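Hypothesis: this fold can be encoded by more than one sequence.
Test: take the C-alpha cells below, design a sequence, compare later.
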C-alpha cells in the first residue's frame, strides 16, 4: 500500500510537540514521541505483526497510530471502563471512533487492532478512489489523515492535515512510523 520510507513528512506541529514538553518540533519531535512509546509497544508485538500480515500493512504504521492515538495505552489505561479517549468516543490502542463503528475486542486486544487496521485499509481504498493520480505514498498519507478526520475532509495533498487534530495528524504518524521502521521495537 505505499512505502512508508517514501512518504514526505514535516512531523509534529509545535502544539503537539509542546504537549510532550519538547523544546523542538517537526520530525525530530515525532521521533522522540515514538521512542518514548517504544517500550510499551513491545507488549503488543504479536498482535501488531499478526494484523500487519493479514492486512498487508507495515507494522511500523500500526505502531505509529498506536503511539499517536493512545501513547501505547499510557493515556487510556485508567479510564472506567478502561481504554477510552475523546472523552468516551474513541476506544482502544488505536482509538476506533464508536460513532462510525461498534468497537470490538478488549481495548488492548488483537481483535481491536485488527478492526482499527481494517478501518485504515478502508480509507486507503477510498483515497485511492478519490485521488487515483496521487502517488501510492501520497495516497497512504491521505488515508492516514482520513483515519483521523474522514475522507470528506482530505481535500488536497498539500493541505492533507489542515483539517486534522493538531493540524499534523498524518505528518506526525508518518514520521513516527519512519522511526519504528528504522529502529524497530
Amino acid at each position: 500500500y505505499g512505502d512508508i520510507t517514501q512518504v514526505e513528512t514535516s512531523g509534529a506541529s509545535s502544539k503537539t510537540s509542546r504537549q510532550d514538553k519538547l523544546e523542538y518540533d517537526g520530525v525530530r519531535a515525532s521521533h522522540t514521541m515514538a521512542q518514548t512509546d517504544a517500550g510499551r509497544m513491545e507488549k503488543y508485538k504479536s498482535f501488531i505483526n499478526n494484523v500487519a500480515k493479514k492486512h498487508v500493512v507495515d507494522p511500523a504504521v500500526i505502531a505509529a497510530i498506536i503511539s499517536r492515538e493512545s501513547r501505547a495505552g499510557n493515556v487510556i489505561f485508567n479510564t472506567t471502563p478502561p481504554g477510552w479517549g475523546d472523552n468516551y468516543n474513541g476506544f482502544g490502542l488505536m482509538q476506533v471512533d464508536k460513532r462510525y463503528h461498534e468497537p470490538r475486542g478488549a481495548w488492548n486486544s488483537e481483535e481491536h487492532i485488527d478492526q482499527a487496521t481494517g478501518i485504515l485499509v478502508n480509507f486507503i481504498q477510498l483515497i485511492q478512489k478519490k485521488f487515483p493520480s496521487w502517488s501510492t505514498e501520497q495516497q497512504l498519507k491521505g488515508a492516514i489523515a482520513a483515519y483521523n478526520t474522514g475522507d470528506g475532509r482530505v481535500e488536497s495533498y498539500e493541505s492533507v492535515d489542515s483539517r486534522t487534530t493538531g493540524k499534523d495528524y498524518s505528518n506526525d504518524v508518518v514520521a513516527r512510523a519512519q522511526w519504528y521502521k528504522k529502529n524497530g521495537f
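The first strand starts at residue 84 and ends at 85. Residues 110-130 form the longest helix (21 residues).
Hypothesis status: open.
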